[model samples]
Target chain A: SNAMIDGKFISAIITAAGSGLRMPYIEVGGRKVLEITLDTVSRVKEIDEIILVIRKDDEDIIKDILEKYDGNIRYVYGSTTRELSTFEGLKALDPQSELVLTHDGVRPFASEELFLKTINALRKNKAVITATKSKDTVKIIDDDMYVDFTPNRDYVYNIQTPQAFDKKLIYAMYEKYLASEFKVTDDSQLFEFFDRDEKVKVVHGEYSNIKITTQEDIIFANAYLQR
Target chain B: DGKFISAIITAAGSGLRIEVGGRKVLEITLDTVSRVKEIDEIILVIRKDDEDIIKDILEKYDGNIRYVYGSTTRELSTFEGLKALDPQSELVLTHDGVRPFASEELFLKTINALRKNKAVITATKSKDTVKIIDDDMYVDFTPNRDYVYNIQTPQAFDKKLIYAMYEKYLASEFKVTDDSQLFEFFDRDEKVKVVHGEYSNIKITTQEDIIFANAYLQR
Candidate 1:
């Protein structure tokens, strides 16, 4: 297996366009949720180029933050949907880039070790992402709150981001998405649709890496940041 | 390398929630001593008066198994069990004895992780949104729901590391709910690895939990 090779460049496209309604009024170490995420992404050496996709109005705030960091940071005004913003960010990458890692801006605790592992795996495999082994016995709930069929816990894993993909494959996948109106929450689903193959690899991510999606999430993010 | 590693199974709880009219640890449904294979010796901690009942049940395991009488406080009982370990013990695994379904694989994994980092424990990822709340029902803060994890045990530790931590905690008389707090007090950057444990590894703190364990064990 050609596992020892490193790609020419790895571009990171972080989608920061959404208004954080869940974390409406939370701060981590005197910084906003998106700001801390950018700080973490800035520290990663493997990510050669960093692009932030934000709303047209937030461009000044995003630019003012990046001006202090001495790295190849760029920003693109994005669409209302996360998928559209991610597509815009991908279009801003260098043509020579071999890999693209799409991550949620809210999940800042994803460690460097996990990033390198996902990149290494994606270099060998067509697609790779971070996930945690599901421990909770899951039961589907109906609209009436009645319990539905209990799925096999052994086969279930809660998938998280930095979902890394071969740039060419991801571009093809996104192109397919542009041609259709089907909405997907994550990039893995997009790749699954394009590849027609269910072989996306899952790598271990840290338990502390959380996505800020609600009021409770903001409190935890602040505590995690302090730690 | 052949130095034996002993385990202190803290099973002295009164089963206040289980409401079973017997020694909680001795309840047949919560028996987990047989699953552990890596440890060279096992010492079970039980309430002082219930020693005979526990010994009678664990006696068949002989030589390797011993019982330590403990106090009302769970932490005090664990401390008593820790003091009873043989002098040759290089490492110690303090596990919740009521968690009968903890797998040998997870125990081995904890041991290996602790070998690399003096203090290591088992944990599961938190799927639900967790909020930090203060008095008056006000939300103090919230962490990203994706990152929070509910920590569990066979919390493994180097004997000396744990001994030092336990001694420090004992001296300060700090009230801690779990053993990991001792290490946390010392501010050790211990690497906690997430070991995939069975849902059957439920702590039999309630009557429903015991009922579940009973049905699970029969499986």
Candidate 2:
């Protein structure tokens, strides 16, 4: 069902809640991961407002990043849990925003085109996630780590972030989700949890758009930049 | 207990997918595997048409390596390789011939695990979150991130166990992506011990992979 599609005034909430634990607080190419992400996010002219949700203890680092790069940027204090942090990030956004995106600050390579894909997709589907086809054979193992079965590899996709959604729908779902004890690993899972009817739309993304979580990932990010 | 490890390099598919210049991925795998001190014999599984060239190559290499002409399928091909091995060989490590980057350490590590677990595989954890979906691709549930692993090869197994598995599967109609699946098929209790592998240990499936492989080799 094709509907209203606009690149106008999309907003984003980037969760940098665990930066110190993930990035090792290093300056990758003269800029930290948060700066690189905001730098990339700022380049996407479609996203008019960028909200960064980070640990309150990370005030100095976030401020340091804020001073280094300029955008339509704002900050909110993150909670102990990612769910609460993301909820706080949503609350920080202007209630009138048509499309809002949730992304990981550690993921610095998500391009403008990917952001655009998530934005345009919000027109048709209420929520969208940037993902790519899994290149390797995927196995479903039992708790004992023995192979239970192999699923069709073609159907398996690698889920990434810069997950976009209609802000109102997410806020409503977020409200209900927070009130209930239902667990969620991602923002899209909340939609999957609340409105079982709405399929979180999947947008094909590049493999280069990776999240930096380990020492090995930093090497990859450096290699990607070098290439 | 001191019987040397035997490796079965499974290259039985249509090399139609791999580029011509990079066809030596099998050779590369052999050359790299030869560095492992514990591995005494290598059984190369190849298409029947390529038998002459492989035999010609093996005559020059000093290692105790031999080629077994493959059948209509990989299961049959691996079984043929197993049957060809000198009954004295103890441990079995099956690897994808096209994946040329499995380090010597990965080989020895896999063999070490095989000596203990009987079924061990080289795998890497998923970098991205994975999902279980229904028929129409709607998300069902995401399995715990810690439990998820991307299966790779240099999958080491006990020779007798894998020989039994191949013999069983050759009789049945089950198709497999890798040898570890056979353990699941046999419903065995032994866990496929995971030996962490390098991401650079790529399977050269496409022309781009060859290009990447060349770059990785240079790196």
Candidate 3:
């Protein structure tokens, strides 16, 4: 029974709605952040379809970026917030998709190894997220600017995208989120809530993978992309 | 003659913490050792009881191969190996046998740096801010990140410079983590240089690391 669904279509939902305030003007091969991310996903054979979630106002620019790929790519209008944008992208996925991978467009260095590991993990587990173990000492700061507590470094990890999900499970979770105004940070957090009735696996990811959120990050991202 | 250099791979430790069944250093990938083209002689520092195991593995190499049993301590073991070396050898490279991914480019770079400075070692810059905290949880001092780097081996040393440094420290019963620190005790900082190394050059310490190393080999 499982063999028939094993090789079904795998789609990638890339969130590019946020106006990259940090990297306003970084270009690689004469293209922007969204274009570089799209190029990387298109190069990977495992990603069968790509769905881009962009701001409704930036439809023209997003359309121009899609024209470069010269393939049928689904573009959907993103909501005001990141959590909502992901929800919008999920709604546009092919109903026949067996698995969905949600990725951040700002992170351009997602490797083939990570993609393979995530998909392989999803094949066995109900939900899987990518994360790297934190190496430094973590401290909790109090209101008086005093060290309140020190968290165990071995137990903490920095989570990153793209987070893989079994399509049916994520769709059901998204429907639950739509009913309530619960403020969620990431897909894994939503899955964590759902895990009360199920399980979520955290897979080890690379350290070089970073989220571009500031201006200094743009310079680093450009240097990394060139390398 | 191109300067004949001796390679010492330290694999004498009892890896009780590692989940893998074999000795830690012997488990290193062959691809790592195959990169060095100019190694005239290779030395393995092993326990006295593991002589048969080391001999069986390295039996193919008939020439310029030797194994020196370690003493009770690391410093004494290193001194024992140093005493056994031929007087004609100009440079001695002390490398951690467990680090199997040391690239040829990095090794050559470190050797070149050592040639100019006479004391060279490999180190990577610390990217995070460092802070000193007291037992009462007060901020003692926030150390600058620019001056800090996590040091790693193959620490290259001038054969005579290290021998002299070791002899001086042997009488005092002083123990330092790396060979570079031993030279520093004698006010010998002028010759030391830092060489950059790749992040992929990781030292295998645990069972999970061994699995990752196997995956790296497939690549």
Candidate 4:
């Protein structure tokens, strides 16, 4: 039985189509990065199924790597761009899915609490994202490397993953987004552009839940795993 | 080598619980900065009661090191350290005493960068995308990650300019999180330059950070 109110079903889209060798099933705290992410996501009882979108070239290798995972998982071959890969995940969702959560497979530290909080937030809002307050005072610099402006730290946050959404709304937004010429770094950007009136909910996330992007991140991940 | 460079290591906070490998955080910071040949003087800004610890640590080092008592606030503590610097000091770097891993190389980089720039700071390109949220917790704006930076310490400046800025800061009602903001607050014509720093140079503030610091040292 799912934890969602009523009989609402939740399907998660974990995008793992990384084009580099930085996080290639590398071991941190006795498990790979993606494996750790999947373990945390699978522990949440509210999630009914997981749609793991990975690069088409990783079809054989990652399948071998995922053999240890026993969760209700399905693999979807990712397209070239991020938006295209996400759309592939969207198309793979079950028709009965009322909620969809998109997370980064490389972010190994996202806890079950974060997942539940994001999903619970979606009970009131159309879209929800997990984030942490910015630790450092940020600077917005221009291309020439001069300070353009400095925003107040109280209003600034470092955006993290596990962005939850209403399945139908996000599916329609993706359809509209793909047809347009705009580009985005994450799924929430689509909300800002297409669904400008709707407020995307923000849930407080753990500061340790960092996205693994470079080799330096692997070292940080190891140090973080010590806790 | 002709220009006199001074470093003001600010360790003026109370409840000195942060430690790594049984060594005091400020001692580790002092050890590293003492090895930097370019720095001509070191001003250790400390809490009122921590003079005994600083004095003991100071006995272990040989370079020109002096300590001064700091006020309650971090801004005032930094100003106290700034005022204690030798009048001939041309360049000054203000670093957090808790940040134990800022390498000697980073100190040199900040000093070297100051040759062409007025105010130079050590910062890392933010790993996560930065967003501006309203009070209701809705995302207001998401700036380009390429242009965004997470500011770090060992922020270098011309000694006279920083001293003057701190004086102005004391006179005005403006507030800041880091010293570099003085340039932004006062609307200085000279812009602050950025130099990349290692991600491992983390400030040890919390218990979780203590765990990470110990883990980092073990590795």
Candidate 5:
């Protein structure tokens, strides 16, 4: 019971560093992704320190998002690459922090239960990320645009974020690995390269927990948010 | 301009993945595609047990639609529908009764693409990075996510092409779940051009999905 309630010691690095280009492109509900995102994570009792990573130019814009809920948060300037941005935010957390989560700010619909399940999974596993089973045949393609083969769909997954990690596993890599040299997109790749033996367990996430990276996605998001 | 296109809708499962009101899901799918102006005719495959209900349902569509009693497997059931199609059918569009969201725009795109590409299917881009896992869930080589698509239904093909495939292949193999996969199974050397589809066009298979379908119907 207290497994979820004991999240007061957990630190979360919420990356909102990217230019809100995709969001502003939406005719309406444009800037709501980050606002709604921060609001949702802030309400989770499982997160203690919420580090919202953003660019220096975005400081004033983010500051204007009035208090909709109470979640202990701080802002830090990010760098060119998303990896560096996440590293900067991770470094700001307490040196002793153990359990930590990295999430995309544009992904606004990760439910509260999903947050708890991830946190719980991290207690046993070295790393945990969320994903859903792919409904259709997943085809592998060659460099020449040839579909090389289709995998057994039962074994494939559409990976999503709100990836939870043992603070040391991610922080250790972030602090030492040169972002330019490593060239990773998501944090789970760090496990593949560094801790090859670990299983980054996948938990079920909502189909609606979509990344708001396009105008068309806004339609899906709007319907998801409504009912 | 007078080309005839026929649709074979395979709606033959207890749909254990769906609401208790599963039969109603099939009706919604039929109604949705019957609205497509480009389709010349439809051959609906239904369960043998539903014949009594089918007789009554036929009264609603005023004979615009035809039905065939389904077999044990979906592959067999589609073949049965194929047997029911008019020999002059130019294109064959096969769809799933559970997936009721094939939009008119999507249907017409597949139809028009079939004119050039000869084979067209509906699918959407993979939203997340896909990983191929092994039997034990071990990570395999990562395929380029850019080319990965979640293939959907209402796959349109030349009637001759589909008929040739069924005649040459169906009984030869025992495991094709859909029409597109049958083409892939035979190494037909066709790219099977993909027409981009919507994320909301989901297959309604659960009570939760029925609720979603009602909302999708609204928009």
Candidate 6:
């Protein structure tokens, strides 16, 4: 994978374009969350280009943050939903780009090792996503809250971001997804429902790679910084 | 007007001895279960060596609190507690003695669900998306996050059904991971109801968890 790492043009779609209501801008250990994310993603030598999807209102803030990095980083305006914003970022990708990675901007702790792992795995598999083993036992339940059955914990993996894919397939899937009435929680589901033949490969990510979604998450992020 | 509820708190593990907020972790757990008015008796399954410290902590309690020596494994320890429950008890709640933050209301919630359902367990909807993986660490499938829950303790059960399942468990050499699995293995007809558990209902199993527990306590 390392021999061809320089040959493949990988474009990262870092989605920071979500509404402010989801989670307020905060600093963990005095560093902005997006800044922290950019710090790590920019350090990965295998990642060729970065396309940061930003809201129109935060253009100045996003642009200001980009000035600190020396890498090939660019920005595009995002739309209403996360999927549309991702599509906008996808549209902005360089025509030379062969592989694509989509990551949540709120997740600052996704390590450099995870980024390289996802990209290298994408070389072998069509779709590669990062996740951690679920520490808690999960139950599959109905609307009435009655459990159907308990799935084996050995198989269960909690999904994380920094999902990598072959650019040609991911772009096609996103275009198909935009036309369909279906909705998805994560990017990997695009391949699951739209293209059933392809299996998404999973890479084990760090448990500390948490997305800051609440005030409670902010507390955890600050506490995690201590550790 | 209420059912005869008995709680079996399992503290026999050779794991953590750490305290949260200046109190023993088991004491914090006991404090909540003791406050639940529905619980008629508390059966603490503890290590024989820790009896003095456990008994000292239970000294101030007003209710029927008793401790019994446990075996090498959790399955056997829980079985010992089941055998000690009053013969007339109709309901049972099996909880982890290390989970100090399981709320008093959570206990009542699990107990209330047991009225219609044969078995009930407390759990929180998993915040992260779950994937089923293969032996090679490749993704097999992803379970819908909405359907998936991080199961917690204080699993309420019908005593008659649970007691019978325990006996069946002893006779068979099959290994069980959880108390609710007894029902899954022996009796397939009964559906375990799910009660929404608090996110803070954390078990202090690791050193890092102790730090989080203390941080939560301070918060």
For A1-227, candidate 1 gives per-residue lDDT tens digits of 12254645889988877763123433556777777777878888878888888777667667777888898888887787888888899889998888888888777677777777877876557777776645533333233322223233344456677888888888888899999986664676775455455356767667777787764465555555545
Q: In order, what DockQ does each candidate have?
A: 0.02, 0.35, 0.02, 0.52, 0.27, 0.66
Tens-place lDDT digits, model 6, residues A1-227: 14555587889999988862234466677878889999999998788899999888888878788899999999999999999999999999998998899999999999899998898887678889998888888778899998878787688888889998889999999888989998887888887777467888989899899988776677777777776
TM-score value, chain A, candidate 6: 0.95
TM-score of chain B of 4: 0.96
lDDT of 2 by residue, B1-219 (tens): 586688888878874235424546777777788788688888888887777767776776886888888778767787878888878877878888888888888887778776568888777777678876555555656777676779887887788888888888878877777788877778888677777778778787755556556556655
True contacts kept of each: 0.00, 0.46, 0.00, 0.71, 0.39, 0.73
Task: Give residue A199's lDDT in candidate 4 (0 to 100).
Answer: 82
**Docking quality category of candidate 6 according to DockQ thresholds:** medium
In Å, what is the interface RMSD of model 4?
A: 2.4
lDDT score, residue B95, model 3? Answer: 75
Q: Top DockQ: which candidate number? A: 6
TM-score of every candidate? 0.51, 0.73, 0.49, 0.86, 0.70, 0.93
Give me the candidate number with maximum TM-score: 6
lDDT, candidate 1, equals 0.66
lDDT of each: 0.66, 0.77, 0.66, 0.84, 0.73, 0.85
**lDDT per residue (tens digit) for residues A81-182 in model 3:** 887888888889887787888888877777877877777777667677776655533333333322233333355455677788888878888888878776
Docking class of 4: medium
Off-target runs (Cα >4 Å) in candidate 1 are: A1-3, A20-26, A141-148, A225-227, B1-219
Q: Kindly report which residue stretches of model 6 are placed more than 4 angstroms away from their true locations once superposed.
A: A19-24, B14-16, B214-219
The true-structure Cα RMSD of candidate 4 reads: 3.4
lDDT of 5 at A158: 77
Better of 1 and 4 by TM-score: 4
